[PDB]
Amino acid sequence: SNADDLQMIEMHELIQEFYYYALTKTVEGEQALTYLQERGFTDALIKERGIGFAPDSSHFCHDFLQKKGYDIELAYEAGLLSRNEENFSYYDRFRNRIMFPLKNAQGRIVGYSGRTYTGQEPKYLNSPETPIFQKRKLLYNLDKARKSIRKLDEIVLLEGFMDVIKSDTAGLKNVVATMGTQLSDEHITFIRKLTSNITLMFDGDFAGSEATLKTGQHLLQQGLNVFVIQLPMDPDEYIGKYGNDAFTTFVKNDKKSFAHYKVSILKDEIAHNDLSYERYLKELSHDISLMKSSILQQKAINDVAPFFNVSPEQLANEI
């Protein structure tokens, strides 16, 4: 019920204050606090994002919500507590982890990502699927970035919420990310309403490349204008190495239409494998045909044609 959903949100938003105090003031939170600070997290950023610490007692959250008068089973259903099958008793889901609040589209805290700082696994522990937290719907940082997204008529999708945090502080405001899932049809529906331009900036590794191609391809087919930013590397590493301005400048300078990025990745295979040459020529020709922007479509043709050693006209004809 809506009444219950609201109680679940209340629980999250109240415990947040406790998590925040635990991190910034208490003895047990000192290690986690120093960890964060050594990694560029200033006291301002920590406060701004309400980052906190979950003690390791395993009843810290339980006892707090119990003292407040919340139904323990409801707290379990809100994904803040876990349950012992054998005992049937309840305990904290999140223990000895740095707590990043997960806010919904309206800015209400509906879940948490708990990050280890002692090399435990999973490295990141998220809230489970609940009535108020659904990974296929929530986009980290969306409520904060909505304004800049509409203003710039562009949304930038990163690989993880951590990248979003780093980028956001650096000066890149129209950024969001899923909670470790593939962009869903619901996500895409939401995004389409804000803008028709979506830029991908995933990890600069093979895995990230494959994600870029798979996500970008679907977005293109869904009628969106897709762009790609390719780091030499992750935002965190780039920002530290060259600073914020250098980062935001690199992002603004290099931004390729999906089709141009795609063929550049397939460059070598196309030039050494005639079977692939033919297949990718047809693919890119189909890809370019999906582009709604006449202007960018034409530029894509000019940019892609050289990769197949054909003229823009011959590629245009093929399309």
Complete DSSP assignment for 169-205:
HHT--SEEB-SSSPPPHHHHHHHHHH-SEEEEE--SS
- For the CA atoms of 23, 24, 28, 33, the dihedral, rounded to the nearest 10 degrees, stands at 70
Q: Are 156 and 175 in contact (CB under 8 A)?
A: yes
Q: In this structure, what is the dihedral angle of CA atoms 80, 162, 97, 139, given to the nearest 10 degrees? A: 0
Name the binding residues: 159, 203, 205
Phi, psi at 76, each rounded to 5°? -65, -40
Report the alpha-carbon distance of residue 63 to residue 143 in Å, rounded: 31
Alpha-carbon distance 6 to 19, whole Å? 20
Those residues whose C-beta lies under 8 Å from the C-beta of residue 289, and which sit 6 or more positions away, are 319
Q: Can you give the resolution of this entry in Å?
A: 2.2
Method of determination used here: X-ray
Strand 256-257 and strand 225-228: the pairing is antiparallel
Provide the Cα torsion 182, 123, 34, 235; round to 10°. Answer: -30
String of b and e for 258-282 (b: at least 16 CB within 10 Å)?
Answer: bbbbbbebbeeebeeeeeebeebbe
Nearest 10 degrees: CA dihedral of 19, 24, 25, 28?
Answer: 70
Tokens of 87: 């005992």
What token pair was written down for 20? 């925040």
In the block, tokens 């589209």 appear at 105
**Per-residue b or e along 225-257, where b marks 16 or more CB atoms closer than 10 Å to that residue's CB:** bbbbbbbeebbbebbeeeeeeebbebbeeebbb
What's the CATH architecture for 135-257?
3-Layer(aba) Sandwich (3.40)
Residue stretches of the annotated binding site for Mg(2+): 159, 203, 205
Question: CATH 3.40.1360.10 region(s) of the chain?
Answer: 135-257
> Which CATH architecture best describes the domain 258-317?
Up-down Bundle (1.20)
The C-alpha atoms of residue 125 and residue 36 are separated, in whole angstroms, by 17
CATH code: domain 1-134 is: 3.90.980.10
The one-letter code for the residue type at 12 is H
- Residues of the chain within CATH 1.20.50.20 domain(s) are 258-317
Reading phi first (left if > 0) and then psi (alpha if -120 to 50, else beta), residue 91 is in: beta
Instruction: Return d(Cα 127, Cα 78) in angstroms, integer.
Output: 8
Q: Which of 126, 77, 57, 59 shows the shortest CA–CA distance to 98?
A: 126
Asked if 267 and 277 touch (Cβ cutoff 8 Å), the reply is no
Query: What does the DSSP assignment read for 232-265?
Result: ---HHHHHHHH-HHHHHHHHHH--EEHHHHHHHH
Q: Cite the residue boundaries of each domain of the chain with CATH code 3.90.980.10.
A: 1-134
Backbone φ and ψ for 240, nearest 5 degrees, come out as -65, -45
**Residues in the chain, how many?**
319
Q: Can you name the residues that pair with 112 across neighbouring β-strands? A: 101
